[PDB]
Amino acid sequence: NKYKRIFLVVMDSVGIGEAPDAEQFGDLGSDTIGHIAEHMNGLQMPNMVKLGLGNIREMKGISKVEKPLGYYTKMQEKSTGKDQMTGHWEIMGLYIDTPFQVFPEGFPKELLDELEEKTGRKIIGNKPASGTEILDELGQEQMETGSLIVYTSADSVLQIAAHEEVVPLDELYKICKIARELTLDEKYMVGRVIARPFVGEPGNFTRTPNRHDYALKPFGRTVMNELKDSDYDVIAIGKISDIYDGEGVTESLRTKSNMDGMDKLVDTLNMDFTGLSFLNLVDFDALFGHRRDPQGYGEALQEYDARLPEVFAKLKEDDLLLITADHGNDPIHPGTDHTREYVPLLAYSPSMKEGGQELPLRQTFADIGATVAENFGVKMPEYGTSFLNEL
Ligand SMILES: [Mn+2]
Ligand SMILES: [Mn+2]
Ligand SMILES: [Mn+2]
Numbered sequence: 266n267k268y269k270r271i272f273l274v275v276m277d278s279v280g281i282g283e284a285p286d287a288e289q290f291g292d293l294g295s296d297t298i299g300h301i302a303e304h305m306n307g308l309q310m311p312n313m314v315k316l317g318l319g320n321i322r323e324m325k326g327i328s329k330v331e332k333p334l335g336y337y338t339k340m341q342e343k344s345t346g347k348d349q350m351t352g353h354w355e356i357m358g359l360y361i362d363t364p365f366q367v368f369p370e371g372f373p374k375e376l377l378d379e380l381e382e383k384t385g386r387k388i389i390g391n392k393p394a395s396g397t398e399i400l401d402e403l404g405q406e407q408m409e410t411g412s413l414i415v416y417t418s419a420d421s422v423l424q425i426a427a428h429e430e431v432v433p434l435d436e437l438y439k440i441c442k443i444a445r446e447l448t449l450d451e452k453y454m455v456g457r458v459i460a461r462p463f464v465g466e467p468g469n470f471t472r473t474p475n476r477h478d479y480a481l482k483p484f485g486r487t488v489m490n491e492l493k494d495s496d497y498d499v500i501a502i503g504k505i506s507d508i509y510d511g512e513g514v515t516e517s518l519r520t521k522s523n524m525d526g527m528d529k530l531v532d533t534l535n536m537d538f539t540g541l542s543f544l545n546l547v548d549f550d551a552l553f554g555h556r557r558d559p560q561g562y563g564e565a566l567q568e569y570d571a572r573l574p575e576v577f578a579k580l581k582e583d584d585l586l587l588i589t590a591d592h593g594n595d596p597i598h599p600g601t602d603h604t605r606e607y608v609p610l611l612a613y614s615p616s617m618k619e620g621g622q623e624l625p626l627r628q629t630f631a632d633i634g635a636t637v638a639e640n641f642g643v644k645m646p647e648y649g650t651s652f653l654n655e656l
Contacts, residue, residue, distance in 0.1 A: 266539075267653060268614065268640050269583040272530065272576075273543045273633065275353070276569070277504075278550035280593020280606030281322055281339055287605045290347060295604035297554070297593040299324045301566065304559035304597070310566060312573035316588070316611045317621060334577075335613025336621035336656055340589065343629040343648070347603045348421050350456045350481070352591030353508045353545075357487035358634030358646025365421040365456045367602055369393060372423065376453045377415065383443050387412040393419060393601070399426065400463055400470040407431070413440065414461075419555035419601040421456035423448060426472075429462045434475055437462055445479040456480065457507075480510040488634040489513025489541070491643040497540030502529045504545045515540075523548040523565060527572040534579040541637060554594025555601050562596045582616045585640075585656070587633060612656055624652050 280297035287293050299322075302308040307326025310318065317333030344351045346364025354361055371391035381388055389412045390403050399416045407414050407428055414426035423444055427437050437460050445458045458479040463472045490513040492499050499515045503526050506517035518533075520526040523546045533542040546569060553562035580586060593606030610627060627633075631649030638644065639651040 266640060266642065267583075267656075268585040269539050269581070271541050271585045271587060271637055271640060272533070272580075273541060273587045273637070274530070274589070275356070275543075275545045276549055276588065276590050277349075277545055277547045278554045278592060278594030278603065279566070279590040279609070280595065280604060281590075281609045282607055283593075284341060284605045284607055290605040292347075292593075292598070292605040295593055295595040295598050295606055297595045297604065297606060298322075298327070298566075298609075300595055300597040301559050301563045302326055305563040308563060308566060310570040312570045312577075313588075313611070316573075316613055318609060318611065320623065321609050332620040334620060335586070335611055335617055336624050336652075337612070338610050338624035338626055339607040340610050340627035340630050340632065341607055342592065342605070343631070347592045347605045348456060349508060349591065350421070350483075352630060353505075354483045354485075354487065355630035355648075356589070356591065356633045357483070357489050357509070357513075358631050358638065358649055359483055359485045359487060360629070360631070360648045361484055363451050363454065363484075366454050367419065367421050368417045368455075369419075369601060371417065372415065373453060376447060376450075379447055380415075380444055383447070384413070384440050386440070388415050390414045390416045393417045396424075396426070396461060396463075396472050400472070404428070404463065404470040405467040408467075421454075422459055423455045423457075424459045424461050426461040426463055429464050429473060429475070432462075434462055438477055441477065441479055449481070478507060480507060482510045482512055485647075487513055488638045488643070488646055489543075491638060492540055492641060495641070495643050497641055497643075498538040498542075499540055500533050500536070500538065500542045502526060502533070502542065502544040504547050505543050508545065523569055524572070527569070527576075531575060531579065534576070540641065550594050550603075554596055554603070557596045557598070557601070559596040577613075577615075580613075580615050582614070584614055586613045587611070587636075588613075589630075589633065591630075612652070614656070617656070621656075624655055627652070
């Protein structure tokens, strides 16, 4: 093998400007990193700059360098959608025709009618809200009537809240499984159904750790599956295991924050393993992109950048570091959805003694999967073109 270990980092939602097909999505003008850089009066990301981020595209505070540490380019998304699962599934070698939906005005009556029809229970709420907001508003009615609080977020989720004393936990799980089946329908396709049991009294409701998630498996066997099947290590960090519903995963490390994500990445650098360590840094998307908070987003990017030199110091000659994103989520864009954008790609190993060069633009995110597959000698994905030989 050319590399013994590949460290793949998804900066979640960290897009590098509108894609050629942005108009279809209402995403003309979208530029996640660029708009953040303008807001910050210049982003301070010296380590990403050293890797060649400015060589992909110059932005405020982000300039090109003469000798980038590694190779650089951007990637274009080929799949129909701009959601979490589409982006990640494409990265690991798939092509996804059918996009996962978001519901800023709640779910269609048809879906909620069938859920009522199958459960014999009333549904209340039906809007995007935080757990705290929806329980403050509807928690008491839920307790008193035995109704189900159905809500969503800015992402592709259907969430069902019920008080543990009123709706038995096991009944809530059964209901969520029904909802999971009903939402395997391209009109109502949600990435994730989430059980949100809660306890307490009016004015003091808390969501319990009895939360359960109901995800869909990727629409195909991924490069992760192939790695696992060939007895390679596949270490998933953060939301990665959940995004792939555990498919191809050999170890999963939960994280609480971006900084904690970088700590677990460091933990994997300290592990003897052969295969893939795969990190998702989700805060960019979950805290700042959807909340349209360019200041928080900018600060988060600077906090992440400052962590990189330790990663650089720990990389071995036979290690490869890959840094990319899965879509955009421009914090100055209208609405609360993701934006259809190119994503950066940086590929660095200390064995690149002469530094890196520009790679041809990646025509699908699956080029990452193809590169991983070729490196480890496992079955090549149906989609994607490896850039391994270019490194
Ligand atoms: Mn838009
Ligand atoms: Mn994402
Ligand atoms: Mn998101």
